[PDB]
Amino acid sequence: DTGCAVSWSGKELKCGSGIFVIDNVHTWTEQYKFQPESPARLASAILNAHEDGVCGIRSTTRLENIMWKQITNELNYVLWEGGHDLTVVAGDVKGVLSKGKRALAPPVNDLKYSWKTWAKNSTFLIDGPDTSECPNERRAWNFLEVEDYGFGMFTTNIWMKFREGSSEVCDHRLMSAAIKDQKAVHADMGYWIESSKNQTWQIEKASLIEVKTCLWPKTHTLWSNGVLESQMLIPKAYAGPFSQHNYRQGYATQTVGPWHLGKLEIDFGECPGTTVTIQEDCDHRGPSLRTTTASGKLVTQWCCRSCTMPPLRFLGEDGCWYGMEIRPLSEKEENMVKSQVSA
Amino acid sequence: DTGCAVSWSGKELKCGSGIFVIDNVHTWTEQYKFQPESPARLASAILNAHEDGVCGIRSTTRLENIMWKQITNELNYVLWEGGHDLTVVAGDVKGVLSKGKRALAPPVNDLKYSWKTWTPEAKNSTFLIDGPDTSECPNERRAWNFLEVEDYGFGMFTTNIWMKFREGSSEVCDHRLMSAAIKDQKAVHADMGYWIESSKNQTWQIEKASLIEVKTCLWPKTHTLWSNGVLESQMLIPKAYAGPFSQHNYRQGYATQTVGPWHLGKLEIDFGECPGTTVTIQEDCDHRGPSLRTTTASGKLVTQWCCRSCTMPPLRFLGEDGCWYGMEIRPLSEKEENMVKSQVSA
């Protein structure tokens, strides 16, 4: 990556070559696009797995769900020209990007209509609401990989291919990481986790435009030695880096945080109108609670047992959510909105 | 770090914010400079250390040796005007930046000097700085790793770095000068004098390194990618020479290179065949040993080399003398006892 960068740092201007890590989160990206493999290998793979017992597909990333939505119509068109009783319904992503337990095998004996590359009583659901009629245990998940990159001056195309097997790790050709002086970052196309040093290395900010469920690869992780799974601020189950930069003093793993929102902004401070004090009389931690009740009134007094100021705070479209360790004082938890993540 | 760069895909321009890991090994042209504390604190610290028993200073970086060679004259001026019988002698560094077993401490009392900012020689007592390895001033009584970066300065011609005394004795290199970055299938570990490159081709293994100095402090693990499951006996660049404690510091078929040609100083580690020499793989081979130069003392070139269980292309060190092969590659046309071998102690 040959180029120049005006590092703010008060001053300083340096140009050269190396690796430059960009945030695609705080740009409202329209420059990255997923291009599928083939209209006949994919339709054949979907049809082949339906007879095996596969119910549908669960997307791994927010960028993959966009791809499934734009190619669904031709996916049904291919399955209709061959006289196949199957319809593909593409839903939208609401909440966590849940994981399935199956995969799509590379098709054999596929269809040859005219090319090779880009309402019936039998449905093939893709994403959408969670339903017990078509459970997640029969849904394909994490069966695609990155092939190359493209151009266009307005968007960059990403070409896909089937995975060689079944894996629980996120695709590494989309992630980054960088440390320099006293600032680290663990980047992604939906994650942007920042850390810094003030007498200690601990997490500083995070912007999640999605909540995944795969595992962060340890080849793209800084300081991944001597890591305890119960200290990871962003849990391992939500693609949190297995690093010691993913840590904050006085806070354990946030397993029952407000991950159901989808988009999140993790930062450390006080929600407007609220006060947090450190007391020994506070009860143990639990599900994260919103600062405003369902009625609408705002809870003002909060307390934690052994946290560290400023308090951990989650910000979404719903409102302001506190950490697991911070508990209400002026209102009973029973009359409060709590995280819907089922432990 | 606001700014933007073209990519390795020919033409891909995208401007945003993040972290830019610039290489300073190949930039050269006096990119950075070291500025000491004050001309009255350093002299007092040196005098107190000499009274304690420390009789020398060992540099940690090539940029620190430049600092000591430019303040020596006005460091001797301070001692001369204070009625003290001591002279500071600053020399060059050749080869590995060796390790000292002592350190200096922040002095509570200061010397006398009219400025707070930067005749017969005699003065039998001498406080050597760097220089050749001697026996009258052993490395067991030499200060080492006692300064660290405080801030980054201001300048149009160059950039300034302000240093200050450490609060304790540590063997880990200063972390305010190093970086590390991975993206897609390309990683890097960088510092002031190191530039270690790695890449993925069916495996993650080291690809190319460029060292303008050889240190002996430890690489901090906060600036290391993939630090889990690392075997110390598999790091290509040994842990004793500031090699990252990472699994990107790896190459298939090669163990740790403890007896390589580190005595050269500047090095260029890469994988390929030297001109005029061929390497083959055969079980009928000798074991490892000190690294050997492909050109003997008289200048004759050894042409045939053989290996036991390494992987082609072979490991190759490039220095001022010429080609040096890895510890696993052995000569076939000439006996090792008639060849120039590595001077690293074994």
XYZ file of C-alpha atoms in Angstrom:
689
model
C 0.000 0.000 0.000
C 1.989 2.951 -1.354
C 0.651 6.310 -0.219
C 0.861 9.187 2.219
C -0.925 9.759 5.522
C -1.251 12.939 7.595
C -1.231 11.345 11.035
C -3.111 13.866 13.155
C -1.147 13.359 16.402
C -1.028 17.123 16.882
C 1.335 17.394 13.895
C 3.498 15.234 11.546
C 3.211 14.320 7.858
C 4.830 11.159 6.498
C 4.572 9.417 3.129
C 5.861 6.039 2.013
C 4.765 2.418 1.675
C 3.445 -0.296 3.961
C -0.003 -1.394 5.154
C -2.781 1.152 5.707
C -5.852 -0.006 7.636
C -9.085 1.818 6.775
C -12.388 1.938 8.635
C -15.265 0.826 6.407
C -17.682 1.110 9.345
C -17.917 4.900 9.768
C -18.454 5.634 6.075
C -21.909 4.171 5.275
C -20.173 1.889 2.817
C -21.503 1.504 -0.713
C -18.113 0.515 -2.160
C -18.028 -3.223 -1.342
C -20.272 -5.727 -3.117
C -20.526 -9.521 -3.097
C -20.741 -11.230 -6.494
C -21.909 -14.877 -6.384
C -20.197 -17.869 -7.993
C -22.465 -19.134 -10.789
C -26.238 -19.145 -11.443
C -26.272 -22.835 -12.052
C -23.826 -24.151 -9.585
C -25.531 -22.250 -6.849
C -29.042 -23.169 -7.784
C -27.917 -26.783 -8.192
C -26.186 -26.698 -4.799
C -29.342 -25.319 -3.162
C -31.529 -27.938 -4.850
C -29.110 -30.753 -3.986
C -29.058 -29.915 -0.269
C -32.853 -29.606 -0.060
C -33.234 -33.353 -0.629
C -30.574 -33.975 2.039
C -32.519 -32.203 4.789
C -31.245 -28.631 4.649
C -34.002 -26.150 5.480
C -32.458 -22.867 4.365
C -29.540 -20.447 4.676
C -28.333 -18.203 7.501
C -26.100 -15.350 6.372
C -22.771 -14.784 8.104
C -22.319 -11.065 7.363
C -24.503 -8.093 6.492
C -22.794 -7.865 3.088
C -23.663 -11.487 2.259
C -27.370 -10.977 2.991
C -27.455 -8.174 0.411
C -26.100 -10.608 -2.186
C -28.762 -13.235 -1.442
C -31.506 -10.621 -1.834
C -30.400 -9.417 -5.285
C -29.990 -12.877 -6.880
C -33.078 -14.600 -5.450
C -35.305 -13.915 -8.468
C -32.918 -15.530 -10.947
C -32.365 -18.325 -8.416
C -36.067 -19.164 -8.688
C -35.947 -18.615 -12.458
C -33.240 -21.270 -12.844
C -35.210 -23.660 -10.618
C -38.383 -22.991 -12.638
C -36.918 -23.582 -16.108
C -35.843 -27.071 -15.022
C -39.285 -28.064 -13.764
C -38.276 -28.120 -10.088
C -40.872 -27.572 -7.348
C -38.917 -25.159 -5.170
C -39.140 -21.463 -4.320
C -36.481 -19.388 -2.551
C -37.658 -16.668 -0.152
C -35.054 -14.115 0.949
C -35.755 -12.394 4.257
C -33.959 -9.545 5.984
C -31.649 -9.507 8.996
C -33.193 -8.499 12.339
C -30.897 -8.762 15.351
C -27.983 -11.152 15.769
C -26.693 -13.006 12.708
C -27.490 -16.446 14.093
C -25.571 -19.538 13.005
C -26.786 -22.734 11.369
C -25.526 -26.296 11.644
C -25.313 -27.391 7.984
C -23.427 -26.378 4.842
C -23.812 -26.326 1.063
C -21.576 -28.827 -0.712
C -20.000 -27.964 -4.078
C -22.515 -29.012 -6.744
C -21.949 -31.965 -9.061
C -23.962 -32.547 -12.243
C -25.172 -28.959 -12.395
C -27.220 -27.105 -15.017
C -26.053 -25.569 -18.306
C -28.731 -23.171 -19.542
C -26.930 -20.527 -21.617
C -23.924 -19.467 -19.526
C -21.734 -20.686 -16.664
C -20.993 -17.563 -14.566
C -22.899 -14.455 -13.431
C -45.050 -20.108 -5.267
C -44.750 -23.892 -5.185
C -45.446 -25.966 -2.079
C -41.743 -26.279 -1.221
C -39.885 -23.329 0.296
C -36.202 -22.548 0.906
C -36.101 -19.707 3.427
C -33.077 -17.403 3.653
C -32.728 -15.432 6.899
C -35.753 -13.644 8.324
C -37.698 -14.220 11.531
C -36.843 -17.221 13.678
C -39.447 -19.965 13.246
C -39.686 -23.444 14.744
C -41.267 -24.860 11.576
C -37.876 -24.416 9.862
C -35.296 -24.451 12.665
C -31.708 -23.245 12.634
C -30.429 -26.809 13.101
C -31.230 -27.473 9.417
C -29.901 -24.176 8.027
C -26.688 -23.842 6.040
C -24.188 -21.319 7.371
C -20.589 -20.274 6.625
C -20.101 -22.113 3.328
C -18.608 -19.311 1.195
C -15.146 -17.818 0.769
C -13.487 -14.841 -0.920
C -11.866 -15.418 -4.319
C -10.559 -12.030 -5.507
C -11.365 -8.308 -5.697
C -12.593 -6.041 -8.465
C -12.972 -2.430 -9.602
C -15.616 0.022 -10.800
C -14.533 3.426 -9.418
C -17.789 3.405 -7.427
C -17.806 -0.070 -5.854
C -15.369 -2.943 -5.362
C -16.651 -6.372 -6.372
C -15.827 -9.420 -4.252
C -15.976 -12.837 -5.913
C -17.128 -15.854 -3.920
C -16.467 -19.588 -3.901
C -17.575 -22.595 -1.884
C -15.534 -23.575 1.150
C -13.568 -26.818 1.083
C -15.142 -28.003 4.337
C -17.066 -26.833 7.387
C -15.498 -24.223 9.663
C -16.585 -22.018 12.562
C -14.005 -19.277 11.875
C -14.733 -16.009 10.096
C -13.237 -15.416 6.661
C -9.788 -13.869 7.038
C -9.651 -12.127 3.638
C -11.929 -9.376 4.994
C -10.241 -8.558 8.325
C -7.307 -6.436 9.449
C -5.364 -5.437 12.566
C -2.760 -2.787 13.291
C -0.787 -1.420 16.234
C 1.492 1.614 16.289
C 3.022 3.432 19.272
C 0.062 3.445 21.689
C -2.978 2.735 19.503
C -4.316 -0.618 18.302
C -7.273 -1.616 16.134
C -9.037 -4.844 15.136
C -10.870 -3.992 11.922
C -13.399 -5.766 9.705
C -16.178 -4.893 7.284
C -18.663 -4.634 10.160
C -16.404 -4.395 13.214
C -14.091 -1.572 14.301
C -12.604 -2.166 17.762
C -10.146 0.412 19.099
C -7.737 0.143 22.023
C -5.232 2.520 23.594
C -2.691 2.767 26.406
C -3.131 4.953 29.491
C -0.910 3.152 32.038
C -2.540 -0.068 30.743
C -3.752 -1.576 27.473
C -7.549 -1.734 27.530
C -10.376 -1.327 25.045
C -11.480 2.212 24.190
C -14.298 2.142 21.617
C -16.198 -0.186 19.310
C -18.619 0.331 16.421
C -20.566 -2.760 15.354
C -22.908 -2.341 12.381
C -23.581 -6.086 12.734
C -23.325 -8.838 15.337
C -21.762 -12.018 13.955
C -21.348 -15.458 15.498
C -18.202 -16.954 13.925
C -14.752 -16.988 15.559
C -12.140 -14.299 14.999
C -9.083 -16.000 13.439
C -6.036 -15.994 15.689
C -3.720 -15.189 12.772
C -5.239 -11.675 12.636
C -5.089 -11.071 16.408
C -2.549 -9.040 18.386
C -1.448 -10.202 21.843
C -3.332 -13.510 21.745
C -1.280 -15.237 24.468
C -2.434 -15.821 28.033
C -6.017 -14.806 27.233
C -8.830 -15.784 29.594
C -12.212 -16.361 27.972
C -13.975 -14.709 30.937
C -12.170 -11.367 30.506
C -13.063 -10.746 26.836
C -15.333 -7.687 26.882
C -16.810 -8.671 23.510
C -17.536 -12.393 23.979
C -15.938 -15.084 21.855
C -19.424 -16.181 20.757
C -19.940 -12.863 18.913
C -16.705 -12.797 16.877
C -14.779 -10.903 19.534
C -11.001 -10.969 19.100
C -9.171 -13.470 21.311
C -6.807 -10.757 22.498
C -5.731 -8.920 25.631
C -6.473 -5.609 23.911
C -10.117 -6.774 24.053
C -10.286 -6.041 27.763
C -11.448 -3.418 30.249
C -10.550 -3.187 33.923
C -13.303 -4.191 36.332
C -15.541 -5.678 33.618
C -15.950 -9.365 32.796
C -17.347 -10.874 29.595
C -20.646 -9.299 28.514
C -22.552 -12.442 27.583
C -26.039 -11.023 28.242
C -25.532 -7.556 26.812
C -27.844 -5.895 24.281
C -26.659 -7.916 21.292
C -30.224 -8.268 19.960
C -30.146 -4.685 18.656
C -27.822 -5.444 15.752
C -26.045 -2.133 15.279
C -24.209 -1.076 18.435
C -21.756 1.547 19.672
C -19.688 0.485 22.684
C -18.126 3.383 24.578
C -17.420 4.342 28.179
C -19.374 7.153 29.790
C -22.643 8.112 31.439
C -25.946 8.166 29.591
C -27.604 11.606 29.791
C -29.433 12.203 33.053
C -27.913 9.180 34.820
C -25.443 8.848 37.693
C -23.303 5.805 38.525
C -21.603 5.266 41.892
C -19.406 2.447 43.185
C -20.885 0.790 46.272
C -20.447 -2.498 48.110
C -24.206 -2.862 48.691
C -25.002 -3.443 45.004
C -26.170 -6.886 43.918
C -24.445 -9.156 41.415
C -24.468 -8.564 37.675
C -27.092 -9.767 35.229
C -28.804 -8.828 31.968
C -28.118 -5.347 30.646
C -30.922 -2.833 31.201
C -32.096 0.225 29.286
C -32.014 3.612 30.993
C -35.654 4.301 30.031
C -38.560 2.096 31.080
C -41.294 0.864 28.746
C -43.591 3.602 30.060
C -41.049 6.248 29.064
C -39.673 7.650 32.308
C -35.913 7.796 32.841
C -34.111 6.013 35.678
C -31.541 8.352 37.221
C -29.604 6.552 39.980
C -27.424 3.530 39.193
C -24.695 1.658 41.048
C -22.098 -1.056 40.492
C -20.196 -3.320 42.856
C -16.593 -3.130 41.622
C -16.642 -1.573 38.140
C -14.352 1.265 37.011
C -15.432 4.728 35.900
C -16.419 5.829 33.329
C -19.106 3.125 33.110
C -19.551 0.839 30.130
C -22.470 1.967 27.982
C -24.195 0.581 24.882
C -25.881 2.914 22.392
C -28.403 1.806 19.786
C -31.565 3.009 18.069
C -33.656 1.958 21.079
C -31.706 4.198 23.450
C -28.939 3.910 26.044
C -28.110 0.561 27.655
C -25.773 0.074 30.597
C -23.320 -2.730 31.238
C -23.999 -6.005 32.987
C -22.314 -4.839 36.209
C -24.224 -1.541 36.560
C -27.564 -2.022 38.326
C -30.465 0.386 38.949
C -30.922 2.086 42.314
C -34.048 4.273 42.096
C -36.166 1.672 40.270
C -36.720 -2.058 40.679
C -35.346 -4.183 37.841
C -38.689 -5.988 37.427
C -40.300 -2.841 35.943
C -37.378 -2.290 33.547
C -36.467 -3.285 29.997
C -33.761 -5.957 29.970
C -31.654 -7.644 27.313
C -33.523 -10.312 25.351
C -30.397 -12.427 24.795
C -31.349 -15.817 26.247
C -28.569 -17.237 28.420
C -3.916 8.735 10.578
C -5.837 10.601 7.892
C -4.599 9.917 4.374
C -4.769 7.337 1.600
C -2.689 4.932 -0.445
C -2.847 2.979 -3.682
C -3.163 -0.787 -3.219
C -1.339 -3.838 -4.559
C -4.154 -4.391 -7.091
C -2.666 -1.806 -9.455
C -5.081 1.101 -8.943
C -7.285 1.279 -5.835
C -7.576 4.714 -4.206
C -9.596 5.150 -1.006
C -9.079 7.893 1.582
C -10.151 7.472 5.192
C -8.755 7.112 8.707
C -6.940 4.374 10.576
C -3.321 3.330 11.117
C -0.551 3.629 8.520
C 2.510 1.446 9.113
C 5.298 3.170 7.180
C 8.649 1.465 6.723
C 11.658 3.425 7.970
C 14.330 0.871 7.040
C 14.087 1.775 3.346
C 13.109 5.435 3.825
C 16.556 6.464 5.159
C 17.506 10.141 4.562
C 17.642 10.907 8.307
C 13.980 10.365 9.132
C 14.249 10.456 12.936
C 16.551 11.937 15.569
C 17.070 11.319 19.292
C 17.203 14.229 21.752
C 18.544 13.602 25.285
C 17.233 14.932 28.599
C 19.544 17.793 29.659
C 23.309 18.455 29.880
C 23.262 18.409 33.688
C 21.174 15.296 34.418
C 23.006 12.913 32.073
C 26.433 13.959 33.368
C 25.325 13.517 36.984
C 23.838 10.099 36.202
C 27.043 8.995 34.455
C 29.189 10.239 37.349
C 27.013 8.447 39.911
C 27.128 5.239 37.862
C 30.920 5.441 37.603
C 31.126 5.883 41.375
C 28.831 2.852 41.707
C 30.979 0.634 39.484
C 29.511 0.904 35.990
C 32.349 1.534 33.530
C 30.562 1.759 30.180
C 27.361 2.163 28.199
C 25.966 -0.253 25.609
C 23.529 1.125 23.049
C 20.208 -0.569 22.319
C 19.511 0.936 18.879
C 21.558 2.392 16.041
C 19.653 5.654 16.547
C 20.779 5.769 20.192
C 24.454 5.414 19.234
C 24.089 8.520 17.057
C 22.730 10.404 20.078
C 25.699 9.528 22.297
C 28.254 10.553 19.656
C 26.850 14.086 19.236
C 26.529 15.080 22.921
C 29.892 13.681 24.054
C 31.851 16.940 23.725
C 29.464 18.990 25.860
C 29.093 16.013 28.198
C 32.847 16.217 28.801
C 32.586 20.004 29.130
C 30.183 19.651 32.075
C 32.473 17.225 33.912
C 35.573 19.343 33.246
C 34.093 22.526 34.729
C 32.816 20.647 37.790
C 36.258 19.545 38.964
C 35.743 15.863 38.123
C 38.399 13.517 36.717
C 36.425 11.589 34.101
C 36.142 11.584 30.307
C 33.400 10.073 28.145
C 34.695 8.208 25.084
C 32.148 7.355 22.387
C 32.939 4.827 19.668
C 31.225 3.098 16.780
C 29.287 -0.175 16.894
C 30.235 -3.153 14.708
C 27.974 -6.189 14.498
C 25.450 -7.172 17.153
C 24.369 -4.493 19.606
C 25.566 -6.454 22.629
C 23.778 -6.646 25.976
C 24.855 -4.881 29.151
C 24.100 -6.093 32.662
C 23.592 -2.741 34.425
C 21.592 0.478 34.043
C 21.553 4.120 35.085
C 19.112 5.721 37.505
C 17.487 9.164 37.716
C 19.745 11.267 39.951
C 18.161 13.217 42.781
C 21.099 15.654 42.733
C 22.203 17.482 39.592
C 25.613 18.709 38.474
C 26.536 22.354 37.833
C 25.889 23.919 34.428
C 24.962 27.425 33.300
C 22.487 26.220 30.636
C 19.478 23.943 31.131
C 19.335 22.947 27.441
C 21.829 21.414 25.024
C 44.059 21.593 26.665
C 45.556 18.203 27.576
C 43.115 15.296 27.278
C 44.469 13.484 30.375
C 41.691 12.315 32.735
C 42.928 8.743 33.208
C 39.444 7.609 34.246
C 37.456 6.796 31.109
C 33.752 6.046 30.615
C 33.656 4.137 27.333
C 30.528 4.121 25.174
C 30.127 1.252 22.679
C 33.308 0.450 20.756
C 35.034 -2.897 20.293
C 34.531 -5.682 22.809
C 37.334 -5.482 25.381
C 38.339 -7.280 28.576
C 39.206 -4.263 30.744
C 35.613 -2.994 30.336
C 33.461 -6.140 30.233
C 29.787 -6.154 29.311
C 28.922 -7.236 32.870
C 29.628 -3.652 34.035
C 27.965 -1.815 31.138
C 24.680 0.081 31.268
C 22.036 -0.980 28.761
C 18.345 -0.252 28.101
C 17.864 2.681 30.475
C 16.175 5.259 28.200
C 12.733 5.412 26.617
C 10.714 7.696 24.361
C 8.835 10.546 26.050
C 7.289 12.378 23.074
C 7.637 13.118 19.362
C 9.016 16.512 18.412
C 8.630 19.261 15.835
C 10.620 19.972 12.700
C 10.348 20.494 8.972
C 13.792 19.156 8.041
C 13.483 16.086 10.294
C 11.589 14.719 13.305
C 12.801 14.868 16.909
C 12.365 12.270 19.660
C 12.642 13.218 23.338
C 13.963 10.568 25.725
C 13.901 10.079 29.486
C 15.139 7.660 32.125
C 13.338 4.388 32.774
C 11.771 3.558 36.133
C 13.258 0.052 36.236
C 15.421 -2.542 34.534
C 13.718 -4.331 31.637
C 14.922 -6.563 28.806
C 12.052 -5.686 26.442
C 12.611 -3.183 23.649
C 10.837 0.171 23.748
C 7.294 -0.195 22.415
C 6.777 3.431 21.334
C 8.836 2.889 18.163
C 7.393 -0.397 16.843
C 4.340 -1.324 14.799
C 2.577 -4.366 13.344
C -0.150 -4.752 10.746
C -2.000 -7.544 8.957
C -4.478 -7.223 6.095
C -5.913 -10.007 3.923
C -2.822 -12.150 3.236
C 0.069 -9.846 4.147
C 1.488 -9.170 7.618
C 4.432 -7.110 8.841
C 6.380 -6.470 12.042
C 8.183 -3.138 11.975
C 10.402 -0.997 14.180
C 13.114 1.627 13.696
C 15.645 -0.867 12.334
C 13.570 -3.974 11.576
C 11.166 -4.773 8.741
C 9.905 -8.372 8.792
C 7.446 -9.401 6.075
C 5.138 -12.420 6.006
C 2.547 -13.733 3.571
C 0.084 -16.573 3.046
C 0.644 -19.107 0.250
C -1.179 -22.266 1.419
C 0.405 -21.468 4.822
C 1.436 -18.470 6.910
C 5.233 -18.295 6.899
C 7.940 -15.650 6.784
C 8.797 -14.177 3.388
C 11.479 -11.477 3.643
C 13.321 -9.527 6.339
C 15.566 -6.459 6.188
C 17.685 -5.595 9.232
C 19.937 -2.525 9.341
C 20.880 -3.480 12.919
C 20.876 -6.543 15.163
C 19.518 -5.958 18.662
C 19.360 -8.194 21.725
C 16.300 -6.957 23.637
C 12.961 -8.770 23.586
C 10.127 -7.931 21.209
C 7.056 -6.888 23.250
C 4.099 -9.238 22.960
C 1.602 -6.360 22.868
C 2.882 -5.573 19.346
C 2.899 -9.196 18.126
C 0.336 -10.975 15.944
C -0.459 -14.649 16.577
C 1.484 -15.063 19.822
C -0.287 -18.275 20.914
C 1.150 -21.751 20.479
C 4.606 -20.422 19.602
C 7.621 -22.696 20.022
C 10.834 -20.839 20.820
C 12.833 -23.441 18.855
C 10.915 -22.666 15.640
C 11.317 -18.879 15.362
C 13.448 -18.207 12.286
C 14.819 -14.967 13.751
C 15.811 -16.087 17.269
C 14.133 -14.671 20.354
C 17.580 -13.536 21.539
C 17.866 -11.126 18.573
C 14.559 -9.252 18.996
C 12.631 -11.702 16.846
C 8.855 -11.466 17.227
C 7.322 -14.203 19.384
C 4.874 -15.033 16.612
C 3.853 -17.850 14.291
C 4.405 -15.569 11.295
C 8.093 -15.773 12.285
C 8.256 -19.239 10.770
C 9.424 -21.105 7.677
C 8.774 -24.744 6.845
C 11.776 -27.033 7.234
C 13.912 -24.457 9.076
C 14.424 -24.324 12.839
C 15.757 -21.355 14.807
C 18.877 -19.754 13.318
C 20.969 -19.269 16.440
C 24.357 -19.516 14.684
C 23.620 -17.407 11.631
C 25.780 -14.507 10.430
C 24.538 -12.000 13.000
C 28.072 -10.614 13.425
C 27.616 -8.646 10.188
C 25.152 -6.142 11.632
C 23.111 -5.131 8.605
C 21.417 -8.119 6.975
C 18.877 -8.985 4.285
C 17.080 -12.292 4.864
C 15.411 -13.764 1.782
C 14.779 -17.126 0.138
C 16.533 -18.005 -3.102
C 19.650 -19.473 -4.648
C 22.877 -17.486 -4.670
C 24.494 -16.919 -8.088
C 26.620 -19.870 -9.150
C 25.473 -22.183 -6.335
C 22.953 -25.031 -6.506
C 21.152 -26.663 -3.573
C 19.719 -30.192 -3.559
C 17.774 -32.198 -0.976
C 19.072 -35.629 0.016
C 18.843 -37.782 3.133
C 22.576 -38.520 2.892
C 23.542 -35.215 4.504
C 25.284 -33.684 7.486
C 23.357 -32.146 10.368
C 23.020 -28.444 11.180
C 25.866 -26.152 12.159
C 27.230 -22.625 11.854
C 26.239 -20.687 8.762
C 28.848 -20.716 5.994
C 29.815 -18.201 3.319
C 29.606 -19.390 -0.281
C 32.980 -17.745 -1.044
C 36.086 -19.035 0.718
C 38.911 -16.869 2.045
C 40.913 -17.051 -1.195
C 37.820 -16.071 -3.209
C 37.009 -19.466 -4.725
C 33.272 -20.151 -4.926
C 31.669 -23.351 -3.627
C 29.138 -24.475 -6.218
C 27.332 -27.576 -4.884
C 25.414 -27.609 -1.592
C 23.058 -30.199 -0.128
C 20.275 -30.188 2.455
C 18.582 -32.750 4.690
C 14.898 -31.874 5.166
C 14.510 -28.171 4.329
C 12.243 -26.678 1.644
C 13.297 -24.941 -1.560
C 14.108 -22.144 -2.209
C 16.903 -22.086 0.395
C 17.451 -19.580 3.169
C 19.984 -16.917 2.224
C 21.584 -14.059 4.166
C 22.993 -11.112 2.206
C 25.632 -8.922 3.825
C 28.726 -6.909 2.951
C 30.927 -9.987 2.463
C 28.466 -11.776 0.186
C 26.188 -14.803 0.443
C 25.668 -16.739 3.658
C 23.538 -19.874 3.656
C 21.241 -21.198 6.349
C 22.241 -23.477 9.195
C 20.668 -26.461 7.404
C 22.438 -26.057 4.035
C 25.864 -27.695 3.913
C 28.697 -27.670 1.352
C 29.414 -30.611 -0.927
C 32.347 -29.559 -3.144
C 34.508 -28.294 -0.262
C 35.068 -29.354 3.336
C 33.705 -27.012 5.994
C 37.078 -26.662 7.745
C 38.413 -24.767 4.691
C 35.482 -22.319 4.592
C 34.598 -19.052 6.316
C 31.996 -19.783 8.999
C 29.849 -17.661 11.289
C 31.632 -15.976 14.197
C 28.608 -16.239 16.508
C 29.576 -18.224 19.599
C 28.282 -21.796 19.592
